[PDB]
């Protein structure tokens, strides 16, 4: 409960510096699928009836390639916000802060 009045206020007298960690995914593993190898397998008897479903195979491959290029775009976008690359300074002399 809060000790609330109509003429009373509370004011801090000190401060505390705090640090927290936030973890977010950026990209996932890129994959590709060879439909003919996964289905028939070193079979001349098969892979002759897959001429009808080659269109579906192409559709799957197109979707997977789109996913992969999207993953590359995400990885580039997250970390490459700034272009100029700055070398770390030699002398620290940051007034006390230790960034080791």
């Amino acid at each position: 409960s809060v000790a609330y009045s109509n003429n009373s206020i509370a004011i801090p007298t000190n401060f505390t510096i705090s640090v927290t960690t936030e973890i977010l995914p950026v990209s996932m593993t890129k994959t590709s699928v060879d439909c003919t190898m996964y289905i028939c397998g070193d079979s001349t008897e098969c892979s002759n009836l897959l001429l009808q479903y080659g269109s579906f195979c192409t559709q799957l491959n197109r979707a997977l390639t789109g996913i992969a290029v999207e993953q590359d775009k995400n990885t580039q976008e997250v970390f490459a916000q700034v272009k100029q690359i700055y070398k770390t300074p030699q002398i620290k002399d940051f007034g006390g802060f230790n960034f080791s």
């Binding site: 590709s32 060879d34 070193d42 192409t58 491959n61």
Partner: protein, 50 residues
Amino acid sequence: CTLKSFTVEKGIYQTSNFRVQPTESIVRFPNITNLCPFGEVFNATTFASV
């Protein structure tokens, strides 16, 4: 052939996996020489009731 077109632009174009041609062939069967007794069970003089 994979793209089903005559013009290809730039790209990486992950094509189908490579294969190796099995130029030879073998047959392996157990050591059986004597023929089956076809005459014994086909040319039997007597046959049992159903």
